[PDB]
Amino acid sequence: FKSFFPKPGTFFLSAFVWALIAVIFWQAGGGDWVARITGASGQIPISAARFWSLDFLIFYAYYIVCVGLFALFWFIYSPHRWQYWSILGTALIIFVTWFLVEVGVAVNAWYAPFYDLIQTALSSPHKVTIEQFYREVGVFLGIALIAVVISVLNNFFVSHYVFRWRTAMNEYYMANWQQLRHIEGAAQRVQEDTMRFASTLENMGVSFINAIMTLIAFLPVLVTLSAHVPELPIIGHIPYGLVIAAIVWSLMGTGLLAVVGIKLPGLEFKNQRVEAAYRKELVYGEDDATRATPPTVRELFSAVRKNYFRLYFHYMYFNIARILYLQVDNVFGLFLLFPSIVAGTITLGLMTQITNVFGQVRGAFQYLINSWTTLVELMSIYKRL
Amino acid sequence: FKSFFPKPGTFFLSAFVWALIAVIFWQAGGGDWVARITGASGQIPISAARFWSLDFLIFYAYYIVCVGLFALFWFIYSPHRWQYWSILGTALIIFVTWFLVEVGVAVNAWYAPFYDLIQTALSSPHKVTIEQFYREVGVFLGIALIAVVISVLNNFFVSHYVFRWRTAMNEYYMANWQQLRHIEGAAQRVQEDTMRFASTLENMGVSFINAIMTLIAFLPVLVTLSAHVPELPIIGHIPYGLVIAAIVWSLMGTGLLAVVGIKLPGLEFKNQRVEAAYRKELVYGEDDATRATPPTVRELFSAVRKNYFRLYFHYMYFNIARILYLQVDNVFGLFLLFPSIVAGTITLGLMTQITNVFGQVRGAFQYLINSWTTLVELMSIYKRLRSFEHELD
């Protein structure tokens, strides 16, 4: 961190403070202030033309100015020679991660008009025309084309960004190679731990910040869709019944599913430990006739057998919870809507829009169980350095 | 292979010959001969009672007798230490892989009645009742409960199955360690390469055999569903137009997508080559103070940087093709059905059933590419094991 980041003690803190000041000036007052001055309409089209509308273009100017003010503060205070990749570089990655969420809510808002058109078509033959369907696909391809261009440039940029981190650290380590040479375990602390640190930290950083963004974007649309689901199957009418049930079910994908699988990383460590122990007796067996004695290697293999057999049995418990959850998840999204489907309040557009937002919110809490590898791996690497 | 399978030269081939004889006696007659006896039923329920209907469990008897006859031939001729795991163990994995395909077909056939009920409900309020919906989701949980209890026992068995392969190899390499001692890297090949061989070979073995089964199971239903889609969007009426368009689009995940990404495995190798060269230069500089120097390590790292940069640029081409395919695939399944949706010849149930078939068939061709990748990885591992026998022969 000391390399590739200007003073990480006050950086990552002045950034977080500045983010809250900018957000409070936008989402808790203000925001409409600049929008009213410029005369923004305040309406957002479902088409791909939303991304260059006046409402969105205001945010782009605000983001650049706020980052520009933040950059100019650090571009004079403590220059670091990696500013344009450390401060400006990560600002683009945060912004692009937010933009790729707005394309997600754009297609989600597109299912409501598209599938309401399918429902109209199936109810009566030739009530709609074929030319009406093509202009609905032609709108989705506008959003999809934007997502394709931004996503490929996002992965292209972030891959250099993590590589400029290795270039920065190796520049610092090599300049002190005369003292760091004698340290045991080198030539992988500088050759293998540099990438596995930068690559995994960025992966955790974007994934964690993507979870917050996709919850901020998709919880409000669940709330505004909860007006069309007044009642739930078994518990009857409950205020905000849809979002409360959506949150609780989504936690099951990272709660009970993670509780039963918390012992798996512990058992995995023991298996690789006994594998390394088997290696140690095997490597000494090559150089000498003694060691790797056939009575002895039988002991080490009987020790790796039992540790694998215990992992297989414990992973069976995790498989039952995970597989059953996925199978039920195919119909739980539709299960909640049964008292509303029968009542005629929900149309086909909302039924597939509500089903879609369930997956996106589920993919948010997925960034706890699925990212758990990165959270523990970051500390597994930062301790060596 | 010789340490686990009995005479892999013939058994691993005679099994394929025996399968064709058993299949020809089943799918080209004979199956009706044994179904005519005992009456059978002919029809198949959509419920979870599908898997013990008279149509199926006669096939279970046929499978057991055929593998039992095949195994009995190899248990009398050329006996082996790992007979039950190598022959009966492999046969169960093949059968369970087939069974989970029939579970996927069962839920796919369940979409037609369920979604035709949703379409009925949305067209007129209170034309359906809530209890009518609970019965439809009731029969799905019956199939899902069968799926989970067989899938977890499948992974439990196959994980033990690959370990009996590793146990088999070590029992053969040990007691020969006195001759294999002097080979370079013998320790890591007897520990790491003997596990990554069995672990990845089964991944290729089941994925390749899963792709064939899910194509054999889902192409006929796709052809049957093609009667409800007489016309295609642009090309007009085409015989079997749905399945022809489904296959061509599914090959796009193995054609254009694979062609642009063919250079990636080759380009990745050079990256790890230069990176291992960097490690090699560092280790020699760790022992000798004059080996690293401010030059050389600067120059050789510049070869690491200039080689990664060509991977990022080339992977950008693969991203455009892959991401665009996935984005379009969200609506291409519905694009073909547009002239049929407007014509009223299709319902909501068939629209979801046809769309679901596209995903399963697409995953079949996905399984073939992953099978090829696992096979080429296996060759990278099999060469080490093939060469390891230097001293034995």
State whether B125 and A339 contact (CB < 8 Å).
no
Secondary structure (3-state) at B232: strand
Give percent helix, percent strand, percent coil of chain B, each to the nearest 5: 80, 0, 20
List the structure tokens of B198. Answer: 């069995």
State whether B319 and A155 contact (CB < 8 Å).
yes
Q: CA B75, B77, B83, B88: dihedral to nearest 10 degrees? A: -60
Burial class (CB in 10 A: 0-12, 13-18, 19+), B303: middle
| φ/ψ of residue A73, rounded to 5 | -70, -45
Which one of A137, A260, A268 makes the best mutation probe of the B interface by having the most chain B beta carbons within 10 Å? A137
| φ/ψ of residue B232, rounded to 5 | -110, 160
Burial B115-124 (b: 16+ CB within 10 A, else e): bbbbbebbbe
Q: Is-contact A305 A271, C-beta < 8 A?
A: no
List the structure tokens of A189. Answer: 């602390």
How far, CA to CA in Å, does A268 sit from each of A18, A253, B155? 41, 21, 17
Q: Is-contact A324 A76, C-beta < 8 A?
A: no
Nearest CA in chain B to A124: B344
Q: How was this structure determined?
A: cryo-EM
Q: DSSP for B271-285, please give it.
A: HHHHHHHHHHHHHHH
Say how far apart CA A26 and CA A36 lie, in whole Å: 13
Say how far apart CA B147 and CA A385 lie, in whole Å: 46
Helix (H) or strand (E) holding A232: strand A231-232
Strands B236-237, B231-232: pairing is antiparallel
B182 part of contact set with chain A, CB < 8 Å: yes
List the alpha helices (DSSP H) in A4-129.
14-27, 32-38, 54-74, 83-86, 88-123
Say how far apart CA B134 and CA B223 lie, in whole Å: 31
Secondary structure (3-state) at B29: strand
What is the C-alpha end-to-end distance of chain B, expressed in Å?
16
Say how far apart CA B143 and CA B109 lie, in whole Å: 11
Say how far apart CA B111 and CA B113 lie, in whole Å: 6
In 3D, which of B98, B212, B209 has the Cα closest to residue B150?
B98
Secondary structure (3-state) at B231: strand
Say how far apart CA A143 and CA A120 lie, in whole Å: 24
Say how far apart CA B42 and CA B163 lie, in whole Å: 41
Q: Is-contact B391 B182, C-beta < 8 A?
A: yes
Say how far apart CA A159 and CA A161 lie, in whole Å: 5
Min Cα–Cα distance to chain A from B78, Å: 28
Strands B231-232, A231-232: pairing is unpaired
**C-alpha angle A12/A13/A15, rounded to 5°?**
70
List the structure tokens of A229. Answer: 């689901």
Residues preceding discontinuities in chain A at C–N > 2.5 Å? none
In 3D, which of B143, B172, B219 has the Cα closest to residue B5?
B172
B118 part of contact set with chain A, CB < 8 Å: yes
Burial B177-214 (b: 16+ CB within 10 A, else e): beebbebeebbebbbbbbbebbbbbbbbbbbbbbbbbb
Q: Which of residues 200-259 of A touch B (CB under 8 A)?
A: 233
Q: Is-contact B357 B229, C-beta < 8 A?
A: no
List the structure tokens of A161. Answer: 């960004």
Q: Which residue has the tokens 């379009």?
A: B328
Say how far apart CA A143 and CA A126 lie, in whole Å: 28
Say how far apart CA B92 and CA B98 lie, in whole Å: 10
A62 part of contact set with chain B, CB < 8 Å: no
Q: Count each helix (H run) and each strand (E run) in chain B, helices first.
A: 15, 2
Say how far apart CA B196 and CA B383 lie, in whole Å: 13
| DSSP type of residue B48 | G
Q: Is-contact B117 B128, C-beta < 8 A?
A: yes
List the structure tokens of A99. Answer: 């933009």
**C-alpha angle B342/B348/B349, rounded to 5°?**
140
Q: Is-contact B215 B250, C-beta < 8 A?
A: no
Strands A236-237, B231-232: pairing is unpaired
User: What are the extents of the domains in chain A?
Assistant: 1-199
Q: CA A207, A212, A216, A218: dihedral to nearest 10 degrees? A: 40
**Nearest CB to A174: which of B279, B297, B330?**
B297
List the structure tokens of B82. Answer: 């790992």
* Chain A / chain B CB contacts < 8 angstroms: 191
Say how far apart CA B126 and CA B102 lie, in whole Å: 35
Min Cα–Cα distance to chain A from B118, Å: 7
Min Cα–Cα distance to chain A from B6, Å: 24
In 3D, which of A347, A367, A366, A361 has the Cα closest to residue A118?
A347
In chain B, beta strands by DSSP E = 231-232, 236-237
Burial B233-272 (b: 16+ CB within 10 A, else e): beeeeeeebbbebbeebbebbbeebbebbeeeeebeeeee
Q: Is-contact B360 B104, C-beta < 8 A?
A: yes
Cβ-based neighbours of B233, under 8 Å, separated by 6 or more: A130, B335, B336, B338, B339
